[PDB]
Amino acid sequence: PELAKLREDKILPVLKDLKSPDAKSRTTAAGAIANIVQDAKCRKLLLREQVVHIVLTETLTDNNIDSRAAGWEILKVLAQEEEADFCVHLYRLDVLTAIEHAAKAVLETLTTSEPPFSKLLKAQQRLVWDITGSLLVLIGLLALARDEIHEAVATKQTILRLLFRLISADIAPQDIYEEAISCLTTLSEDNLKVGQAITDDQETHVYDVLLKLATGTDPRAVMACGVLHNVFTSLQWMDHSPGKDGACDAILIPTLTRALEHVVYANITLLALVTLASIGTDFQETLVKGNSITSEMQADMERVVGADGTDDGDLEDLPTLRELIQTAVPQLIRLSNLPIDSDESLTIQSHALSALNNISWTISCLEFANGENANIHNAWYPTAKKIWRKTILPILEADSADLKLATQVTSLAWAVARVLHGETPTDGNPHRKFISLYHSSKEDPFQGLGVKCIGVVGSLAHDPAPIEVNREVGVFLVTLLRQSNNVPPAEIVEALNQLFDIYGDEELACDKEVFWKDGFLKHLEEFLPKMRTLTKGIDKRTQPELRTRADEALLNLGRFVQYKKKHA
């Protein structure tokens, strides 16, 4: 159209000037082109004008460093403004090769002892840094875009070597250093070849560098932690099977926590929180694979340490978990609490939440029935309680603001409830707040809030809950059942299972005082057929999980109504 006409008028010459086999005319022309190329609407023309090809084809191979550097900046800018597909296209022309070469050249420049780098002209080295910058960025976006690219990149050895070279020597600008650190973080995440590349590097020993960094007082320690964490988990350096020098995941948690101590750089904060949350899901992996004052007065004081102890633990085999609990969760709570004043700490709260959510859901998945995992239960129970009161009421007492935050704190409350089980504190009658939330909030199948409210509520209603609390809640669930006409099936499975977990023991006061007194078993015999219909009305192929779930629910319901009779 017309807009395009004015655009081509502006643009076309510049390309022709770059196109100029006046490689210096284009040192100045290409040098111009990145500035020219920032514009959004205009770019789509530029792209359609086949710039990508020209640059890739010509500019990068020129003998003048200003050419290549202008050209690598062109690509960078492009990939940034544009969308992921773009990078995937670059990967198709194997820009990777072009980069590998580029990085070899930077690497020879740094590591060289003949010129050598440090004695280079001021703008000389500034040019290298400019080139490195674009190179880094590209690898970032390319790795991120797709998996098969993330692999392809963690295969080009020269690339890794360069990233190590920088991170290790720390003689480049902080914007560049930090960019390198990031780039390694992406590549190192849930990837093995990179995990090993960093550990197995004896050339610069980039590992020991990171360790030191994430260990000490350096302002950048957190970033180091992000990488190192990715590594530990990538090669499974965990509690049950530590790395060299017992490098478990645990050792990071102090520095992360100290990064939290100060908030009352800003990016540094968010990052640490994010790490801690990942540590949460990843010690899931730990637990899966696992299965006149002195002297002897102190000695004795270790006699009372049997009681769950603040300072150190029974948990010699699980330092990760104790560090989380002992150190991390204090600060996680405080941050979950403190004021909602800006949107920045709104984010920080949503994070600290996500973290506690993670940890708590991980642990809550274990077995604790009878004396199972007693030690773990004994360390967690206190903390689960503290979390409950300290962070779950206040946000519920506020009735303040957000919806998705409600999902957050609801999901969390579910986790805590899964562990606490009727031993869970009752103040301001929270089960009513949640029930209200269920009705007022009236995708993936089981992400819906109704489910999460069914869950937490049916959890806190176990024996020995206040018999009245028990009553109202059981009532709400059975209510759901009678009027199951519009309730999503997921919520049926959760409701069924909730009641099954609450009223399976006749020896419980609520069995008689509530279940029998209000004659639930009638309503159950009422729903048995309804359940069978909705069950058969579910697609075992799209999707099977829900179907099989309901099936077992019907069996146990089917079984349990039958059982329910067994006892009058």
Binding site: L144, T185, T186, E189, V274, A277, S278, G280, T281, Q284, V288, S354, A355, N357, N358, W361, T362, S364, C365, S411, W414, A415, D444, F446, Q447, N497, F500, D501, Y503, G504, D505, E552, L555, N556, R559, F560, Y563
Partner: peptide
């Protein structure tokens, strides 16, 4: 009472807030 379930950890596995990498503007 008694009950039947399987592979539960998988079920609730999903809820862990999950993260992967990736923005800012204005200069």
């Amino acid at each position: 009472a008694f009950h039947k379930l399987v592979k539960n950890s998988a079920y609730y596995s999903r809820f862990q807030t999950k993260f992967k990498r990736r923005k800012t503007d204005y200069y």
